[PDB]
From TrEMBL, chain A:
Cofactor(s) essential for the protein: Mg(2+)
This protein's name: Ketol-acid reductoisomerase (NADP(+))
Gene responsible for this protein: ilvC
Domain KARI N-terminal Rossmann: 1-170
Binding residues for NADP(+): Y24, G25, S26, Q27, R47, S51, G132
GO MF entry, a single one: isomerase activity
Organism: Staphylococcus aureus
Length: 313, 313
């Protein structure tokens, strides 16, 4: 466990260099504005559109992506994972230089070999956490060509404010596989069908879908907020003895040990690469499987019940 | 599917009636001063203790439970499910008069037969969900005076539960949906899912800190998006990779067997098995309850959260 804080970072390896934040999403605006706030020459390279325009109205200098990397000394690629492959080949790699940084916030395209950087460029990762009211961030290194890849990555995490709560060192493999697993097994995929199958149980049992919507979904924010502030022991403390007791004896009944075996099964396909190439080759086929799965989820009763409760009268 | 607000309570039944709220917890104090601020005669009924005169020093004239029930016409019991059965039989029921009104915020003791009220008394329920504005629940067990629904709905505004709406339900539905939500999704289901996800990453060799982030700490952002714009807002705000993993791995982790495990939990809540199991352990000194809560405190997840939250402002 190596944790670097603001006082741990001593030199300013980032000053004197120009920064190219590729893309202007929620994280692109967060990185780009946090650097100019600390007196850094930050540039933004994105395609023309509504986020191109928005970056202009926020006082930023927006350019095509092929010129922004020509201009800068550190390129932070914050584009969607599915489009980073071809944007790197047609707009970033032909305009690369020597001894300067190819940064990322997620190591999907790097760890899975989709983006192969040359030897004479530093390739690091800096992944902010939580608000992106400070949560420790992560950072890692794939290549060290300039001899200052560590101090460039750590001073960049300091520039975006990621070192205020401390940055934890990791690898491109560890950040990619733990991020992908949490989304699939717990946070997104795991919880959503956990809420769906609970909602379907109550509705099929003759209970009102509105009362079922509160008990399996809307009431979770309070439980999750308690866990976010004081951990799981805070939830067990704040909830009633009847609720805490039911947690203990019925939790393992729902999440049987076989569910844990399913989590290790999906983690295996994240490590070998079965998930990555499946998500990529479906993207090359117009996202047919992806879009069909997205649209079919809207046919669930729980989503319609939710919007009807939100459009109250 | 119908909802009642302040504009639907055309007639106030609580006018000129002394109301006793048995207990003085955070819920007992919220009811007691809400009705007093809206022009209602309220009196606290509680045993002598540090919270007895705590209610007296807050501007209430507080009597023992036996006398507070006698001089009142609407008796509201806001005490834990473990204690309601005893003080009702020993203090409430002997002093209960004809055409009175027995009130509750939860229907555990009524639906499971722990508290069996007389036939000549009104029994209703008002269950808030806020302590933002969310709709509340209400129901009527018995209607002796012929005004049990009028007294319940006007009491809903006395506490201030009308302005966001009140949805009708029964004691059976309010109790079973509340118990199932905690046992199958909210507390039992989610925390066991997070534990199995955390154990999977630590047993695979990943850092426990990054494992704590991606299965617990990042959930607050996801649940906040689901609280604001439903489940559709989650898939809309997360990346395509997280959205794609949601669809392809969610059903892998939560298999159809997980759903029928929740039907077993709901079955044990319907036939009263879970209730008397909880009462059996309470009458034995909560021996298995406190053994279970110490096991959970020994999980690696909790100590990792403590050392990770201490570095957060
Ligand atoms: C902070 C909270 N503690 C509890 N305990 C329960 O039993 N139910 O049902 C709840 O909704 C809540 S909320
Ligand atoms: C609102 C959020 N959308 C995403 N998408 C992702 O892929 N990861 O990894 C995240 O952490 C988050 S948070
Ligand atoms: Mg992430
Ligand atoms: Mg509840
Ligand atoms: Mg409850
Ligand atoms: Mg991700």
């Amino acid at each position: 466990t190596t944790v670097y804080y603001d006082q741990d970072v001593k030199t300013d390896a980032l000053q004197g260099k120009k920064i190219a934040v590729v893309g202007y999403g929620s994280q692109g605006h967060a990185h780009a504005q946090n650097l100019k706030d600390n007196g850094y020459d930050v540039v933004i390279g994105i395609r023309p559109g509504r986020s191109f325009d928005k970056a202009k109205e926020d006082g930023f200098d927006v350019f095509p992506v092929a010129e922004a990397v020509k201009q800068a000394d550190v390129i932070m690629v914050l584009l969607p994972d599915e489009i980073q492959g071809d944007v790197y080949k047609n707009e970033i790699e032909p305009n690369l230089e020597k001894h300067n940084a190819l940064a990322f916030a997620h190591g999907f395209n790097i760890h899975f070999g989709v983006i192969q950087p040359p030897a004479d460029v530093d390739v690091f990762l800096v992944a902010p956490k939580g608000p992106g009211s400070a949560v420790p961030s992560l950072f890692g290194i794939q290549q060290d060509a300039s001899g200052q890849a560590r101090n460039i990555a750590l001073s960049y995490a300091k520039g975006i404010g990621a070192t205020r709560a401390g940055v934890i060192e990791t690898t491109f493999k560890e950040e990619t596989e733990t991020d992908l697993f949490g989304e699939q097994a717990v946070l997104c995929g795991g919880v959503s069908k956990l809420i769906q199958s609970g909602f379907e149980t109550l509705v099929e049992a003759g209970y009102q879908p509105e009362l079922a919507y509160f008990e399996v979904l809307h009431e979770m924010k309070l439980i999750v907020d308690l866990m976010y502030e004081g951990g799981m022991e805070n939830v067990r403390y704040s909830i009633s003895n009847t609720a805490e007791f039911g947690d203990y004896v019925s939790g393992p009944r729902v999440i049987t040990p076989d569910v844990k075996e399913n989590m290790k099964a999906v983690l295996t396909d994240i490590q070998n690469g079965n998930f990555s190439n499946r998500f990529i080759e479906d993207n090359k086929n117009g996202f047919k499987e992806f879009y069909k799965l997205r649209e079919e989820q809207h046919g669930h009763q729980i989503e319609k019940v939710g919007r009807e409760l939100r459009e109250m009268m």
